[PDB]
From Swiss-Prot:
One of its GO terms (molecular function) is aralkylamine N-acetyltransferase activity. Induction: Exhibits night/day variations with a 7-fold increased activity at night. At the mRNA level, the nocturnal increase is lower than 2-fold. Keywords: Acyltransferase, Biological rhythms, Cytoplasm, Melatonin biosynthesis, Phosphoprotein, Transferase. Monomer. The interaction with YWHAZ considerably increases affinity for arylalkylamines and acetyl-CoA and protects the enzyme from dephosphorylation and proteasomal degradation. It may also prevent thiol-dependent inactivation. The physiological stoichiometry of the interaction is not clear. In vitro studies show either 1:2 (i.e. 1 AANAT molecule per YWHAZ dimer) or 2:2. One of its GO terms (biological process) is N-terminal protein amino acid acetylation. Its main location: cytoplasm. Changing residue 89 to Q: Decreases affinity for acetyl-coenzyme A and for substrate. This is Serotonin N-acetyltransferase. Changing residue 87 to A: Reduces catalytic activity 270-fold and decreases affinity for acetyl-coenzyme A. Its EC number is 2.3.1.87. Changing residue 31 to A/G/W: Drastic loss of enzymatic activity.
Amino acid sequence: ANEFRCLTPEDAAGVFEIEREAFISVSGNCPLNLDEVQHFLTLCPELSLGWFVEGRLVAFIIGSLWDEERLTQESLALHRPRGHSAHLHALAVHRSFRQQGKGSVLLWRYLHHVGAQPAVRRAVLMCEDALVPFYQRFGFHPAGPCAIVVGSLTFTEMHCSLRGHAAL
């Protein structure tokens, strides 16, 4: 099979009860799902999207809504219901399906999925300088400052308008 649907607490639980799965095309910044994201599948499963092959979860993205122009340390673990931005918290490519383009395919679909919601006017995320060029492939642009620090690392804040005048 091959399905793309939102995640459930069950799914999350299924991910935690096994070994370990890859981060999006980056070493060092290995996958951190350590509950900082699990609660999102309770507060807002609509902002998650998993890729299932014959039922098996091969990749997923977990997000939440942000209601401010810029990201803050607290935003990274918050969900503001009446918010207009899809804050990406984790992009994972499971069972090592690395280098198969699955990360981009999922992301392309995720932005389209969340962009379909009338209130979600844009996607927002934090990322290591190394991954900046990557996120730019999907419409993201470096917003600027945003002094968020996961660990000790200084991340670049990325924004992606989901609303655009289609002409070509």
